[PDB]
Design a protein around this ligand. Structure first.
Ligand SMILES: Cc1cc2nc3c(=O)[nH]c(=O)nc-3n(C[C@H](O)[C@H](O)[C@H](O)COP(=O)(O)OP(=O)(O)OC[C@H]3O[C@@H](n4cnc5c(N)ncnc54)[C@H](O)[C@@H]3O)c2cc1C
Ligand SMILES: Cc1cc2nc3c(=O)[nH]c(=O)nc-3n(C[C@H](O)[C@H](O)[C@H](O)COP(=O)(O)OP(=O)(O)OC[C@H]3O[C@@H](n4cnc5c(N)ncnc54)[C@H](O)[C@@H]3O)c2cc1C
Lengths: 485, 485
């Protein structure tokens, strides 16, 4: 066939797989994407969501947002400055972010050029059969077919897309995509959604808002950050509120309308109403398989669009594999990359490999941030008869001094009480995204709580708290909480 | 029988741990002795130890304060506009804040003793009458008033260390870390003598709080500052201190110091160089504080430097006399002294002999930028194994290209035994490295191999993910000889 492989989606996983195949294995690969540079109209582009309108830019923006606290907190450590003079400049933030992302975009032309057998093809990928991939002008299956690629293997890696509401006024809302290109910071912003993207953006808006502004975060549920440790969800909620964010639970917009001055009027399902400069929907990310014509090749997909796969990322059609967000397993970049590498090993190096999706460390770049890995106690309790929960918190000394007395650092460890094995480690507070990476190496090695407490702490750090937790706070006996076992 | 089961001379990190453990957990009658309760002049260290009073605790708070110079500066690239001329350090407020924090810890001991039956605090200078009697005198003077005579079963010598002085003309004109903690004003011109960690840490503190137009020099008689640490990280740290305004003077050593008419110190280096500073701080070493204990009265053996000789179980050549902590000149860190204290109690009073494991102990350098390290540096590893692999990676975070602090390179170096992949040492430089290194220490204790590091999925974006992305050695040492293959 003309190509050994055709990857639809040149993102985290797809670009990793393609380059590995062509580069480390001399296969002829075609990778397809919609654009070569970041931003509208497609947003994601060559490099993926993470490079363009994901992890990379949002982290830069959260870093920029962190200075609001830094300028305030320096006062207790004897830093004098005119604080009344402080004015964040959103345009300058967006400009620096743009220049940094464009630089990564620029980096690819050389990548391809230097890799024989690796080619980039622009347009909308779709399937004609299990060996033929079409590159079309648009998502419409009726649009012009620009290229027809004949290939042995197919790798579907189209990622995900923002989920919308469909209420009246949905078109007056934005999503993370457009948030990355706003002309100016909203004075009043509504972040809809309880997930990490929503919370991360509420923090960014909270810092860059015009003095006197307000950021509201609305979640239809009981508590934000569904899926994360219950106590950290509760504690983070308090710290966001302490910093000015109005966290509104059991809250959902019913309809949005455009005011005369261009602001947005929101009528909530509760009957509550409010005006905002910006209403951002961060309610979920949908597997992007809807226009690939999978049935043309008979590929099985879940009701939500997720492409079904086995441990080695093989769909029901043996020569078609799918990796990354489109598979709706763990939606994080390093996992997509890992899967992309495993697939190449399996298919072109005769080394079958299944990505291990358990004990995957992830971070929540909220202000203040979280670093977590493994099971929350509730999940552990369902899988093990005896589970122990260790918890430790404290307000670092530096925060009493800074005045941010609400900044408690919290560490919670979940173990299988039968053998002491650590099933999950959940942290809240500054530096937790960095600490959790090394904690993940310990969990991968099957550390027991004793491996933690027998290690000599590094002092003074927040991380040494991991090594001083020896007695459980409570337990779960066959799924039920008990104060003792 | 004896009046006391145990008398601890020095109620610091290790001593207070051992005392409290024995009385609380073993119902032993324990007398702990220290020079004072309140931190500061005249004795500096106090009940709580050097770490709480004039060490780790206030040092870290001062380093955090110093970091704001850079962070407030770095905010501009992210769009933070403020009157840059108005930014100025206020040393006295830093000191006051730190004093208040340390005092609050001093005050906590009151309840600690009140709530611990059989645990008593005795204030004064402890000394040996014989192996079963400890005197508490008025001063270090062997001829001062005897306040108390303590008859006891066991004696634990935990008196810590003390700053080493130069003994050159003008030594009396210099200060040490002790006084540095109470300076009335930040020196506009300062000289930090020594290449060890305390000197480097103070250089960064002084560099931030100095009045504009000020200067900090760091003189070290040797080739490269931080003897004992990874050589590449040492080089890199030196350049980053230079890039932040610090003149690092290797092969420099004051020969004479005199007091100028305006009260400033005039230093004449051995080199022939001469200069004036407002403060000259010597941080060249810390000597075992055993000289006024009258150890000869019990026949306790000491080394030429005053270090009390001990076995793995911390026992001196006198069976009922133990010694822990800095006074033993083993690993001069708080957590280690604490560990030794707990092991001591288990051995003597819980009849569960435990020898502290002084290997694979992680530690940090709170310089600006910081370091987090653990295990063997490659030079020592090359000496004990026949095939050593060195892995290295450095990158300059994108955020620093935006902040303007372009010199802020992050570095990770891993030393392994190439024959089996065992990770012998991990050395990191850059922000959060003290936080990251803590869990690295847990896995090295667990016998981690390099594959454990690289099979762990990364957390993105973080600097720590670099630890899990290294799989090819940079070079090797074949039987001590460095080679590329
Ligand atoms: C705001 C935000 C913040 C995030 N923050 C983090 C974080 O901090 N850390 C983290 O690990 N993860 C984070 N993520 C998730 C991370 O971006 C994704 O998990 C990862 O990018 C998914 O990788 P992928 O290979 O599955 O797909 P992607 O990287 O998304 O790549 C898919 C590519 O396919 C292209 N494409 C789609 N359809 C077609 C088609 N029909 N034809 C051709 N090309 C097509 C798209 O243009 C896209 O470039 C974040 C996501 C968002 C949106
Ligand atoms: C500036 C500085 C920064 C440091 N930073 C760090 C760091 O970041 N991390 C780290 O782990 N370590 C650090 N250290 C080292 C740490 O402070 C020590 O390793 C630790 O305190 C040693 O514990 P110890 O029990 O041996 O003695 P100490 O904690 O020093 O306690 C000894 C006590 O004995 C008392 N004493 C002395 N002689 C007598 C006597 N004759 N009678 C009665 N009482 C007496 C003293 O008052 C003192 O309180 C630092 C040290 C300094 C000076």
């Amino acid at each position: 066939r003309a190509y050994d492989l055709v990857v639809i989606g040149a993102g985290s996983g797809g670009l990793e797989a393609g380059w590995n195949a062509a580069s480390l294995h001399k296969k002829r690969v075609a990778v397809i994407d919609l654009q070569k540079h970041h931003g509208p109209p497609h947003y994601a582009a060559l490099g993926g969501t993470c490079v363009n309108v994901g992890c990379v830019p949002k982290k830069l923006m959260v870093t920029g947002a962190n200075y609001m606290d830094t300028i305030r907190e320096s006062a207790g450590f004897g830093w004098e400055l005119d604080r009344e003079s402080v004015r964040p400049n959103w345009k300058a933030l967006i400009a620096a972010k743009n220049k940094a992302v464009s630089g990564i975009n620029d980096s690819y032309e050389g990548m391809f050029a230097d890799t024989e057998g690796l080619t980039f093809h622009q347009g909308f990928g779709a399937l004609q059969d299990n060996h033929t991939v079409l590159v079309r002008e648009s998502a419409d299956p009726n649009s012009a077919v620009l290229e027809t690629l004949d290939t042995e293997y197919i790798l579907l890696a189209t990622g995900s897309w923002p989920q919308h509401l469909g209420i009246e006024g949905d078109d007056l809302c934005i999503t993370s995509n457009e948030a990355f290109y706003l002309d100016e910071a909203p004075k009043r912003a509504l972040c809809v959604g309880g997930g990490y993207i929503s919370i991360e953006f509420a923090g960014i808006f909270n810092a860059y808002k015009a003095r006197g502004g307000q950021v509201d975060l609305a979640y239809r549920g009981d508590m934000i950050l569904r899926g994360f440790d219950s106590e950290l969800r509760k504690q983070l909620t308090e710290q966001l509120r302490a910093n000015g964010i109005n966290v509104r639970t059991h809250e959902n917009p019913a309809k949005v309308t455009k005011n005369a001055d261009g602001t947005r009027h929101v009528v909530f399902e509760s009957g509550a109403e409010a005006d905002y400069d910006v209403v951002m929907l961060a309610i979920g990310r949908v597997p992007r398989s809807q226009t690939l014509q999978l049935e043309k090749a008979g590929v099985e997909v879940a009701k939500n669009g997720a492409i079904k796969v086995d441990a080695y990322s093989k769909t029901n059609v043996d020569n078609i594999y799918a990796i990354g967000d489109v598979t709706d397993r763990v939606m994080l970049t390093p996992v997509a990359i890992n899967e992309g590498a495993a697939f190449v090993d399996t298919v072109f190096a005769n080394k079958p490999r299944a990505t291990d999706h358990t004990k995957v460390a992830c971070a929540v770049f909220s202000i203040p941030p979280m670093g977590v890995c493994g099971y929350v106690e509730e999940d552990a309790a369902k899988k093990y008869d005896q589970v122990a929960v260790y918890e430790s918190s404290f307000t670092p000394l530096m925060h009493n001094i800074s005045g941010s007395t609400y900044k408690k650092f919290m560490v919670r460890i979940v173990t299988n009480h039968a053998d002491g094995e650590v099933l999950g480690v959940h942290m809240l507070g500054d530096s937790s995204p960095e600490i959790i990476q090394s904690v993940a190496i310990c969990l991968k090695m099957g550390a027991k709580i004793s491996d933690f407490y027998n290690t000599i702490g590094v002092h003074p750090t927040s991380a040494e708290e991991l090594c001083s937790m020896r007695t459980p706070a409570y337990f779960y006996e066959k799924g039920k909480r008990v104060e003792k076992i």
